[PDB]
Amino acid sequence: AELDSLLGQEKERFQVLPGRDKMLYVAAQNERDTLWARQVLARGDYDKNARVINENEENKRISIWLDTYYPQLAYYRIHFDEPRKPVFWLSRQRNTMSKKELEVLSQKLRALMPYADSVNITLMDDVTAAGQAEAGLKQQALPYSRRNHKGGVTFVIQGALDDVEILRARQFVDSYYRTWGGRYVQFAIELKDD
Amino acid sequence: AELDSLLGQEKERFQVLPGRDKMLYVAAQNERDTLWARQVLARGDYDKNARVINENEENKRISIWLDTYYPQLAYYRIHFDEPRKPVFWLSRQRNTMSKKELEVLSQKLRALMPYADSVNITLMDDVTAAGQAEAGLKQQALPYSRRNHKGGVTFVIQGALDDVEILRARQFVDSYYRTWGGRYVQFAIELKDD
Amino acid sequence: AELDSLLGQEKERFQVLPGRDKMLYVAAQNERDTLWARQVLARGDYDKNARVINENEENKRISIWLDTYYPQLAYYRIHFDEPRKPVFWLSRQRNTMSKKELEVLSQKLRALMPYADSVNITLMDDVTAAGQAEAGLKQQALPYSRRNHKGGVTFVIQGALDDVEILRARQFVDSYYRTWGGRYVQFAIELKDD
Amino acid sequence: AELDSLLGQEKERFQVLPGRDKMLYVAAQNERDTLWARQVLARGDYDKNARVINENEENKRISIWLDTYYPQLAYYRIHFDEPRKPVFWLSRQRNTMSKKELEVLSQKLRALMPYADSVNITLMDDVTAAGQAEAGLKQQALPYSRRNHKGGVTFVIQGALDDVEILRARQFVDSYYRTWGGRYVQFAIELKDD
Amino acid sequence: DKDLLKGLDQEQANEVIAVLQMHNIEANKIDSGKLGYSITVAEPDFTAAVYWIKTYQLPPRPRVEIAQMFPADSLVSSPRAEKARLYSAIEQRLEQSLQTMEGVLSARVHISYDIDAGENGRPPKPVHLSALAVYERGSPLAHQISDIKRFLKNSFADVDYDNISVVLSERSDAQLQAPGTPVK
Amino acid sequence: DKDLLKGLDQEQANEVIAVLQMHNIEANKIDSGKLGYSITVAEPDFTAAVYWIKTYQLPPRPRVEIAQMFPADSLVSSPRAEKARLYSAIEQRLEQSLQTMEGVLSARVHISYDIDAGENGRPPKPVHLSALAVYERGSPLAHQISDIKRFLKNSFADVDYDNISVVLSERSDAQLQAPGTPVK
Amino acid sequence: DKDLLKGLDQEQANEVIAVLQMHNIEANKIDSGKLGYSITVAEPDFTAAVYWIKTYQLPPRPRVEIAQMFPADSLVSSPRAEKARLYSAIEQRLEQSLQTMEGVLSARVHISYDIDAGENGRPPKPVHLSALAVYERGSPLAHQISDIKRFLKNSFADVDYDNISVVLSERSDAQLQAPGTPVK
Amino acid sequence: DKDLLKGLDQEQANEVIAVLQMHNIEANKIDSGKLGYSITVAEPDFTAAVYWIKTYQLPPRPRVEIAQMFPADSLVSSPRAEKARLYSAIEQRLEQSLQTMEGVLSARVHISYDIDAGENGRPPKPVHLSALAVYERGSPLAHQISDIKRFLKNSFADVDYDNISVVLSERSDAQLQAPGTPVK
């Protein structure tokens, strides 16, 4: 059978991507339906070769690659909202690369991802990256402490936190870590007492 | 059978490399699937001779070799992200070798690795090696102590650490030890009390 | 059968060396697979005569010889990374032998090792021998005490050591004893209290 | 059968020596395989007469002889690294024998050992004999006490020794007693307390 | 057809199946009468099935309650043994009652167990409470944490809002797709 | 066909198989009725199988619980013997409850056992807690360590956040490939 | 064909084989029914086999636990005899739990056993801990020694990091080659 | 064919053979069923065999443990008789655990036995430890003596490094050659 029918009964959580390298790629959405789609491709009921790519695993797969061939590169995350044309967020204020080498970077990230048609490297401000993480963190009424560095900022949130401020934090951190990644700003929710 | 089918059912965790020395090389990814691929080659269901090379074992196999024929060589690690053309990181500021002897070094590391087509020795700064290990270590909000030496630097992290600062450390150290190795900067996570 | 097949199923931990003295030599790697290869040659399933030479035993076999016919010779170790052409490390600063007698020494170590084609005696500094043992010992953050002598140096490491400083020591000492031997610098990891 | 096959299955720990006195001599290596080879020659499965000579027993067999026909002779040890041409170490500074009587001594030690072709009496310094026993004894970090005499020196090592200084001592003493014998310098590892 | 687990309880069978069917392998509950149930998966799905048995530590233990260790079978019981059977019965009743709230699907409530009220002359220390709650989707999930801390407060002797730790969460996404038979 | 282990429990059989199938050797669980299960591997895979039996110390012991040493079979029990059966029941119940959190797959919880509250006049010392947790992948794994320290704090008498040591980790990579029969 | 050891347990048979097959001699486990197993090696391999039986002190004793010396068979037990059966149960449970960490394959945990808490008026002295751990290869082996000292600290009454001695090591290199039949 | 020793245990037979085969005489273990084993050597090798029986004091006594003298068969036991059965169980467990270290093949651990903690009003004196260890070859044999003194220290009440005497040694050279039949 063809792989659009070998998966689950309803077909839109699984975005089947025609590849480039004689292969076909399955864009799972979260961690659990990766294990749904990997179970199909591992029991052996699909004759061709196929992978299951995740938005969370293909971020930390290229970050293995990008920590070697392009070190000291200040970036955030690849977004796979459109997996055929992903968006590689890059820091505007902490790079010295001009646009001579950015299509060199895009045409090499395109070689890593055969499902990707073109990788849109866009440059955004790191001030709004720590701005959206602070304007959102005061809006949750969380007692924090900003520790500015170069190439990074830490929002240490200590203290004897009650129940709802551990829950408003983890709803905000997880809704922030999906967007901006955890490479510029780290949230240190440590929980002491008096 | 040919070894692309004698391995597991899904074939991209195992990068089969045609060798040079009448032999064929299997590039396993982590430690566990090395034991997957070594089990095939040891039960005896593949007629030719074949090895299982690892990114972690072929680093400390050449470091046995390179501690003998090139002692007092300041280097970091070989990266096997592309195993046919691996990248040998070398320290820029702690070597006296000119580029007269670097292709002598590359054509002898090429003789150690028959899967390798050419070994790209690139020189990087040791200041960023201790810079990326310190800018990342303050970003985890870890109380440390830098001890500079020549040919090395120690970030001693002592004290009565709580739960999350032992966990943020080991996520950072293991994501650092994979990249820069443990030959320049040592992380001493020792855990005292008051 | 021929001895390349009488050993284990996978053949690269055992480097079979054609000898000189009507004999064939097996270069085992560590101590355990010496007992793998010696078991073949002792049950009696190989018709010719054959030895199992080790990198650790052929160092202390020639050191029995070299403590008799060349006493007061300051040397380090023979390296068997290439067993057909081993490398005999010799101290540069503590010998009075000129190169008139070094090929006399090499052509007599060649007579001890029929597998060896030529024994490369290279002279290295004893200052780096105690330098690599001290720059590495401060990098492990170990509280030590250097005791300089002529023909030797002792790095006494006493005190009530905790768990990780006994483990960082033995990883460093064993990675040092393999390279430079234990004939110039001795590591005295003695463990007192207060 | 001939005695090269009546011994163990693998033949290089036993160096069979053709004698002079209608007899054949077996050069065992250590004390245990002397009892291997003496068991062959005592059960009676070899028709000719044969001895088992040891490096440790033929030292104290000639020292019975040499304490009678050449008393007040300052010497160290016979080395049987090449048993067909053994090396009789003699003290350079404590003898009055010229080379008129040394071939008289060598041609009479040759009569004691029918396996020996010629006994190479070489003269070495007693200052290095106590030098190699003191430079090695400080290198083991052992608290000792030198007691100089004529014809002898004692390195008394007393005190409440801990575990590793009894073990570093006995590794050094046994690696020294094999080389220089116990006729010039005595190691007195006595173990008191406070 | 290859078995995984047999001799299982009715509790344990529907929970091992609900694990495997969440991970795209179809389990087949075979009843064996007096012996208990038995779960057999297909032969291509056998490798992944025995992985999730190890990973989720299946078959599950029965729900350990504190009164199961201090039973009514003993004719005489120590005064510590009836406070721990009292406090066991209260926290079973609170989690029977949180499940009857709006939105809550499951609940586990724990009590700080006082032992030595009469053993040393020390007065009884403050009671601590801890509750889990699994909600339906679409809930205003930061706002029900104040109902439960209000409800659990006035159900005991003298507790504070710093002594009640409600750790609640939404449920997982609904498993409604059938797993699918492996074709061979 | 050559046996490794027979007479095994249902617990022990699915865990020895899950070890061997992780290391590319296919185990064959043969049931023997009243005797228990039996695991036979192939004859080329027998050498590697008996290595991982020694290495992982298989077959596993049953899960040692503290109440198994202080049973209810004794008609009379010392007051130390019902505090250690109480604290055993609590830490079984906490690890039944951490597994019902979001993300957590397994949990092992340990209690500091007070013994001499009434033996010397010393007041009861502070309770110490220690928890393991095995998570699904993709978790924000440094942030759930504050939920568990919040949850475990208000489940006991008087603990601090320095007395709760949560050591959690993500699970291993999923074993989904079948091992593969050795051809001969 | 010549026997070495018969009447062996299931524990002892798979561990004597795993020794001999590591040293290039092929063992043949013969079952004898009610008598236990029996291990026969070949006749050229008999000399080397009986050497490693002496050297590794095989067949192994069963794992000595402290509660095996203080059993529940006695109807009355001294208060020292239930602290030593309590502390035996804790250190069995800790080493059941360290094996469930990431990377750890085996673990042996020891407790300093206090005996005379109530025999002389001396307060209970500090508890000392000691753990072994055998890891998979490729581990950052100097960094897991701080997890275990964190985990073992808050599992007891009042311990320090100077009182916990974790001595861990990587496992041996994997024995995967079959030994090989001696040709005659 | 001439007998040496009959009626031997499985322990004693493989250790008398391992002595004789080390000294170039081939032993032949003959089983006698319910009577135990029997070791017969050849008639030319009989003289040397009975010498090494006298010299090594064969057949060996079974391993004397301290709990074998203070058994659980007695329904009542003195408080000295359960401290000596406790300390016996600890030193059996430590030597079961040192054998699981890297490099160690055998281990014998001894404890200083305190007897009169409650007999004279004297406080318990310091515990002394002594360990043997037999290593594989090629070990950095002066450096493992600090692991064992670290490991044995925090396994007891209050010991010092001057009270732990570790006397370790490498093993003998491997006996792999077959002895050889005497031709007649």
PDB file of N, CA and C in Angstrom, chain H residues 40-81:
ATOM      1  N   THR H  40      41.646 -39.860  40.632  1.00  0.00           N
ATOM      2  CA  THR H  40      42.666 -40.862  40.391  1.00  0.00           C
ATOM      3  C   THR H  40      43.695 -40.273  39.445  1.00  0.00           C
ATOM      4  N   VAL H  41      44.965 -40.381  39.808  1.00  0.00           N
ATOM      5  CA  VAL H  41      46.054 -39.999  38.930  1.00  0.00           C
ATOM      6  C   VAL H  41      46.732 -41.269  38.443  1.00  0.00           C
ATOM      7  N   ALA H  42      47.672 -41.104  37.522  1.00  0.00           N
ATOM      8  CA  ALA H  42      48.363 -42.250  36.963  1.00  0.00           C
ATOM      9  C   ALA H  42      49.342 -42.813  37.983  1.00  0.00           C
ATOM     10  N   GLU H  43      49.854 -44.002  37.705  1.00  0.00           N
ATOM     11  CA  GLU H  43      50.746 -44.650  38.660  1.00  0.00           C
ATOM     12  C   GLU H  43      52.168 -44.065  38.674  1.00  0.00           C
ATOM     13  N   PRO H  44      52.779 -43.621  37.552  1.00  0.00           N
ATOM     14  CA  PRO H  44      54.026 -42.846  37.708  1.00  0.00           C
ATOM     15  C   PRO H  44      53.845 -41.487  38.355  1.00  0.00           C
ATOM     16  N   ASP H  45      52.680 -40.859  38.224  1.00  0.00           N
ATOM     17  CA  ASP H  45      52.424 -39.548  38.799  1.00  0.00           C
ATOM     18  C   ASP H  45      51.876 -39.621  40.211  1.00  0.00           C
ATOM     19  N   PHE H  46      51.813 -40.812  40.802  1.00  0.00           N
ATOM     20  CA  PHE H  46      51.205 -40.949  42.119  1.00  0.00           C
ATOM     21  C   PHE H  46      52.088 -40.382  43.214  1.00  0.00           C
ATOM     22  N   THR H  47      53.407 -40.460  43.048  1.00  0.00           N
ATOM     23  CA  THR H  47      54.306 -39.991  44.092  1.00  0.00           C
ATOM     24  C   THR H  47      54.282 -38.479  44.201  1.00  0.00           C
ATOM     25  N   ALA H  48      54.347 -37.789  43.068  1.00  0.00           N
ATOM     26  CA  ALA H  48      54.284 -36.339  43.088  1.00  0.00           C
ATOM     27  C   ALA H  48      52.904 -35.833  43.459  1.00  0.00           C
ATOM     28  N   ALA H  49      51.859 -36.615  43.198  1.00  0.00           N
ATOM     29  CA  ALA H  49      50.513 -36.170  43.529  1.00  0.00           C
ATOM     30  C   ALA H  49      50.296 -36.146  45.026  1.00  0.00           C
ATOM     31  N   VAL H  50      50.742 -37.188  45.726  1.00  0.00           N
ATOM     32  CA  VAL H  50      50.537 -37.256  47.163  1.00  0.00           C
ATOM     33  C   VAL H  50      51.461 -36.291  47.894  1.00  0.00           C
ATOM     34  N   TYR H  51      52.490 -35.774  47.223  1.00  0.00           N
ATOM     35  CA  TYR H  51      53.285 -34.710  47.815  1.00  0.00           C
ATOM     36  C   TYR H  51      52.535 -33.392  47.811  1.00  0.00           C
ATOM     37  N   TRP H  52      51.871 -33.056  46.707  1.00  0.00           N
ATOM     38  CA  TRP H  52      51.169 -31.782  46.666  1.00  0.00           C
ATOM     39  C   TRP H  52      49.843 -31.829  47.404  1.00  0.00           C
ATOM     40  N   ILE H  53      49.329 -33.019  47.705  1.00  0.00           N
ATOM     41  CA  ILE H  53      48.193 -33.121  48.613  1.00  0.00           C
ATOM     42  C   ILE H  53      48.614 -32.741  50.024  1.00  0.00           C
ATOM     43  N   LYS H  54      49.772 -33.234  50.465  1.00  0.00           N
ATOM     44  CA  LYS H  54      50.297 -32.862  51.773  1.00  0.00           C
ATOM     45  C   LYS H  54      50.702 -31.398  51.815  1.00  0.00           C
ATOM     46  N   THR H  55      51.353 -30.918  50.755  1.00  0.00           N
ATOM     47  CA  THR H  55      51.911 -29.571  50.761  1.00  0.00           C
ATOM     48  C   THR H  55      50.818 -28.513  50.739  1.00  0.00           C
ATOM     49  N   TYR H  56      49.814 -28.679  49.890  1.00  0.00           N
ATOM     50  CA  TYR H  56      48.773 -27.665  49.836  1.00  0.00           C
ATOM     51  C   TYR H  56      47.611 -27.984  50.757  1.00  0.00           C
ATOM     52  N   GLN H  57      47.752 -29.021  51.592  1.00  0.00           N
ATOM     53  CA  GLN H  57      46.776 -29.427  52.614  1.00  0.00           C
ATOM     54  C   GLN H  57      45.411 -29.739  52.006  1.00  0.00           C
ATOM     55  N   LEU H  58      45.427 -30.413  50.874  1.00  0.00           N
ATOM     56  CA  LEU H  58      44.216 -30.821  50.187  1.00  0.00           C
ATOM     57  C   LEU H  58      43.687 -32.119  50.797  1.00  0.00           C
ATOM     58  N   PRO H  59      42.372 -32.394  50.704  1.00  0.00           N
ATOM     59  CA  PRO H  59      41.239 -31.642  50.163  1.00  0.00           C
ATOM     60  C   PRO H  59      40.876 -30.477  51.053  1.00  0.00           C
ATOM     61  N   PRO H  60      40.409 -29.385  50.460  1.00  0.00           N
ATOM     62  CA  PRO H  60      40.201 -28.165  51.236  1.00  0.00           C
ATOM     63  C   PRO H  60      39.007 -28.287  52.151  1.00  0.00           C
ATOM     64  N   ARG H  61      39.115 -27.632  53.295  1.00  0.00           N
ATOM     65  CA  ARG H  61      37.969 -27.441  54.154  1.00  0.00           C
ATOM     66  C   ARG H  61      36.965 -26.537  53.443  1.00  0.00           C
ATOM     67  N   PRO H  62      35.672 -26.687  53.724  1.00  0.00           N
ATOM     68  CA  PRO H  62      34.704 -25.714  53.219  1.00  0.00           C
ATOM     69  C   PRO H  62      34.954 -24.365  53.863  1.00  0.00           C
ATOM     70  N   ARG H  63      34.545 -23.310  53.163  1.00  0.00           N
ATOM     71  CA  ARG H  63      34.883 -21.955  53.575  1.00  0.00           C
ATOM     72  C   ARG H  63      34.202 -21.617  54.889  1.00  0.00           C
ATOM     73  N   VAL H  64      35.006 -21.490  55.937  1.00  0.00           N
ATOM     74  CA  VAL H  64      34.495 -21.213  57.270  1.00  0.00           C
ATOM     75  C   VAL H  64      33.956 -19.797  57.302  1.00  0.00           C
ATOM     76  N   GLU H  65      32.669 -19.671  57.575  1.00  0.00           N
ATOM     77  CA  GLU H  65      32.031 -18.392  57.804  1.00  0.00           C
ATOM     78  C   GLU H  65      31.598 -18.316  59.258  1.00  0.00           C
ATOM     79  N   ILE H  66      31.479 -17.093  59.765  1.00  0.00           N
ATOM     80  CA  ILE H  66      31.293 -16.920  61.199  1.00  0.00           C
ATOM     81  C   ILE H  66      29.858 -17.255  61.581  1.00  0.00           C
ATOM     82  N   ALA H  67      28.912 -17.050  60.670  1.00  0.00           N
ATOM     83  CA  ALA H  67      27.527 -17.401  60.931  1.00  0.00           C
ATOM     84  C   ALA H  67      27.281 -18.901  60.942  1.00  0.00           C
ATOM     85  N   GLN H  68      28.230 -19.709  60.465  1.00  0.00           N
ATOM     86  CA  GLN H  68      28.087 -21.154  60.549  1.00  0.00           C
ATOM     87  C   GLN H  68      28.266 -21.666  61.967  1.00  0.00           C
ATOM     88  N   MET H  69      28.940 -20.911  62.825  1.00  0.00           N
ATOM     89  CA  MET H  69      29.107 -21.297  64.216  1.00  0.00           C
ATOM     90  C   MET H  69      27.983 -20.793  65.100  1.00  0.00           C
ATOM     91  N   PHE H  70      27.239 -19.789  64.646  1.00  0.00           N
ATOM     92  CA  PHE H  70      26.116 -19.207  65.376  1.00  0.00           C
ATOM     93  C   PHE H  70      24.869 -19.339  64.515  1.00  0.00           C
ATOM     94  N   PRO H  71      24.305 -20.535  64.409  1.00  0.00           N
ATOM     95  CA  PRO H  71      23.267 -20.772  63.407  1.00  0.00           C
ATOM     96  C   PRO H  71      21.916 -20.236  63.852  1.00  0.00           C
ATOM     97  N   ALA H  72      20.980 -20.234  62.906  1.00  0.00           N
ATOM     98  CA  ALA H  72      19.597 -19.877  63.184  1.00  0.00           C
ATOM     99  C   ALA H  72      18.790 -21.045  63.732  1.00  0.00           C
ATOM    100  N   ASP H  73      19.419 -22.207  63.928  1.00  0.00           N
ATOM    101  CA  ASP H  73      18.741 -23.356  64.513  1.00  0.00           C
ATOM    102  C   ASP H  73      18.365 -23.126  65.970  1.00  0.00           C
ATOM    103  N   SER H  74      19.152 -22.347  66.706  1.00  0.00           N
ATOM    104  CA  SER H  74      18.806 -22.015  68.078  1.00  0.00           C
ATOM    105  C   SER H  74      17.627 -21.053  68.108  1.00  0.00           C
ATOM    106  N   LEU H  75      16.614 -21.410  68.900  1.00  0.00           N
ATOM    107  CA  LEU H  75      15.408 -20.593  68.972  1.00  0.00           C
ATOM    108  C   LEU H  75      15.668 -19.301  69.737  1.00  0.00           C
ATOM    109  N   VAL H  76      16.570 -19.343  70.714  1.00  0.00           N
ATOM    110  CA  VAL H  76      16.988 -18.154  71.441  1.00  0.00           C
ATOM    111  C   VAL H  76      18.495 -17.989  71.273  1.00  0.00           C
ATOM    112  N   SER H  77      18.913 -16.743  71.052  1.00  0.00           N
ATOM    113  CA  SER H  77      20.313 -16.419  70.833  1.00  0.00           C
ATOM    114  C   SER H  77      20.680 -15.186  71.643  1.00  0.00           C
ATOM    115  N   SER H  78      21.897 -15.204  72.185  1.00  0.00           N
ATOM    116  CA  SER H  78      22.409 -14.119  73.000  1.00  0.00           C
ATOM    117  C   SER H  78      22.634 -12.896  72.120  1.00  0.00           C
ATOM    118  N   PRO H  79      22.665 -11.689  72.699  1.00  0.00           N
ATOM    119  CA  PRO H  79      22.915 -10.496  71.873  1.00  0.00           C
ATOM    120  C   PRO H  79      24.301 -10.449  71.276  1.00  0.00           C
ATOM    121  N   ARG H  80      25.253 -11.161  71.864  1.00  0.00           N
ATOM    122  CA  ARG H  80      26.529 -11.351  71.204  1.00  0.00           C
ATOM    123  C   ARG H  80      26.384 -12.280  70.006  1.00  0.00           C
ATOM    124  N   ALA H  81      25.491 -13.269  70.090  1.00  0.00           N
ATOM    125  CA  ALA H  81      25.321 -14.232  69.010  1.00  0.00           C
ATOM    126  C   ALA H  81      24.549 -13.691  67.814  1.00  0.00           C
TER     127      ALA H  81
END
